Design a binder for these strands. Structure first.
Lengths: 64, 107, 52
RNA sequence: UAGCGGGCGUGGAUCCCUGGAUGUCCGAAUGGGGGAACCCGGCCGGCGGGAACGCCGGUCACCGCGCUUUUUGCGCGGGGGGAACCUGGGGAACUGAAACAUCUCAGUACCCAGAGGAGAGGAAAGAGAAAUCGACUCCCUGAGUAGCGGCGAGCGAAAGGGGACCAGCCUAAACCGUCCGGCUUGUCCGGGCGGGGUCGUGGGGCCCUCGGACACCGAAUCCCCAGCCUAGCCGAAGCUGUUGGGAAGCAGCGCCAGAGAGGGUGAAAGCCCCGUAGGCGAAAGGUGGGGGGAUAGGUGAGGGUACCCGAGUACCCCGUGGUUCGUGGAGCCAUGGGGGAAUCUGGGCGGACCACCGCCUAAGGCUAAGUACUCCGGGUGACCGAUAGCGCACCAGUACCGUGAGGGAAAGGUGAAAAGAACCCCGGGAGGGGAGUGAAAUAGAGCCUGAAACCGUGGGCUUACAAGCAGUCACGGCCCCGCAAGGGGUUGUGGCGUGCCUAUUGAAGCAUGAGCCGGCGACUCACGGUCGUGGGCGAGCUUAAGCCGUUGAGGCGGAGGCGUAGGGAAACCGAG
């Protein structure tokens, strides 16, 4: 029956409604202290593509 | 139920294929496997020397049966499928407009 | 699509010329030879089959 | 299903339809039994002469529910099966997560039990955001959405709306009348029975008030009739010649039709036989609200009082199933323990909970309809033809496997029809040689077809000094087809040559599969996605369930999904 959208990556990723899957930056959690603002403002967003074609698929049915 | 045919043991022609157009006699309805023994299929069996009923001469047969779908009605004419009517009382089966059941004796 | 279907198909028959809508059929009781003589008169023959 | 042999019908048998009848012994077995189909027995009654032997018909085990003076007992039912469908009572493991315990598989297979054509369920402490609808089951979209999770695998609903279908009510308790119980006779506590009422601007009670009224509606119930099934009845139109064993096929004319569906008729028929369209049919039985008589039975407004509205319950806690909820802030339902209300400012819910506003009246009950399925009747198919098809085409749940639970085969066709082969001959028979039969015995009796691997007999070429994945290229010998030219074949010699498949860095490998052949046997589909493609469409597309029609006949049905705005997780900003 109807394939199930993967609730997970659905609950945690973006793709601009043109087809370019663009995600969210990590390595940002339990660090911060000896680090600097450079890593801060950089640790504000992310990118990606190529295998996020397979991920663009994994989204599935409602596309999104 | 309705093994019933249309042929009666009286006298009727034979539009067959063996001896086509042979005058069919008394007919003898046998049985419920659509067949008839008219007076026709004449062969001879190789019966043994059976001393009682077949003395020192045993090689003989007469009239063997045949198929029932090999005959057609008879009247003062020819075959042609029979029409039946309820006579109000009895049940006469006059022929194709041409009269009389083909068996008669008060019908 | 299928609307045009009928149209196209039916209308394409019309391109050939094999067609007609009689006002009312003369054989009024539904018996064979009525429609038969009727057909021999209405441009019919025997070798031609009738989505009638 | 033959012979022997004897009967019966137009005083309408057989055969089909119905009702009853005889219906032994087993089996829920049901008198007691017992290793199933066997062995005993009591009382009512009978026959043999029948008091001892024996039969016949009668009668008898248990549970519940309802009556009988406990008593003697009377009463209706129960209990068994059942392929699927069905509601509850318990409840797996393999797997997925590439381990694996949360989870999943699934409350799924499986065990119990019971219920019936149905059930299950079922008239609102509902559903949920608007002063919205209004029992139940079903189909659809909602939507893999909302939720859920080592936030992994994965699991995963409800409102709304588009339709099927349509159904409403039995009561307790308030109060009252009676018979019974007992009691600390008493203006009494419990019970059986009738009246009485049924709820959301609350409903009635009781008295008082309005005027309460012919009527007005009318079952799930009563009964009957059209019909429906268990058998049927009838029913359209042809010959002559012709080859052939046999015509239905070949020609000549003719014909029925509301019927040219099909099968069969020695093969290939609209007019041969059976039948097809159409038209009628139940004496007896079963089935039916389709229509109606009839029946149970239903309907009002108002003041006061201050009576009752479902108790080991709701409510708090604890241990918790189900649901999206794996316990999270955790709701509602259900319940095992413990604590344990009230009778309408009463109660439960609006997702912890308090405030404001709405929803509905609990803890007793019955309900058809559309749902679900295939033991079964008929009907059909871009279903199969004896390794297929159901396991079982023919006597398949037979053989035979094993004590056992249980396993589970094989095996079809002569012809139109038996005409199914007398008589001679050899022979113990068997089986054949002749004859005779049919169109034909190359259809000869497990007999239409008869192949392959396969074992024989005749003939042609070749072989007894010779080293072989067995052939290949050329040439000679040869024998037989050939008009020519050539062709088959066969091998006398010599140049060349390490089988097939699988597996491997890599095989002749002394790695393996394989004796040989016939046959059976493996990349499909169901949902959705996704790229490319053929077309209708155009900022537009297309309906789903279903309904109308159909007898391979289609159209209708815009709920909904698709598409134009995205960007921030969000509020929301807006070609920004």
């Amino acid at each position: 029956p109807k394939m199930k959208t993967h609730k997970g990556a659905k609950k945690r990723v973006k793709i601009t409604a043109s087809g370019k899957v663009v995600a969210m930056k990590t390595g940002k959690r339990h660090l911060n202290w000896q680090k600097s603002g450079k890593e801060i403002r950089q640790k504000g967003r992310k990118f990606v593509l190529a295998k996020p074609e397979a991920e663009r698929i994994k989204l599935l049915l409602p596309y999104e | 139920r309705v093994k019933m045919h249309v042929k009666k043991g009286d006298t009727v022609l034979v539009a067959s294929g063996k001896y086509k157009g042979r005058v069919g006699k008394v007919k003898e309805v046998l049985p419920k496997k659509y067949a008839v023994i008219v007076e026709g299929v004449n062969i001879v069996k190789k019966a043994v020397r059976v001393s009682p009923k077949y003395p020192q001469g045993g090689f003989i047969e007469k009239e063997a049966p045949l198929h029932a779908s090999k005959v057609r009605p008879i009247c003062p004419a020819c075959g042609k499928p029979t029409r039946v009517r309820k006579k109000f009382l009895e049940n006469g089966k006059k022929i194709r407009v041409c009269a009389k059941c083909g068996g008669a004796l008060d019908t | 699509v299928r609307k045009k279907g009928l149209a196209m198909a039916v209308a394409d028959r019309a391109r050939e010329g094999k067609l007609l809508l009689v006002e009312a059929f003369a054989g009024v009781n539904g018996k064979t030879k009525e429609f038969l003589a009727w057909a021999k008169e209405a441009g019919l023959d025997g070798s031609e089959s009738v989505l009638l």
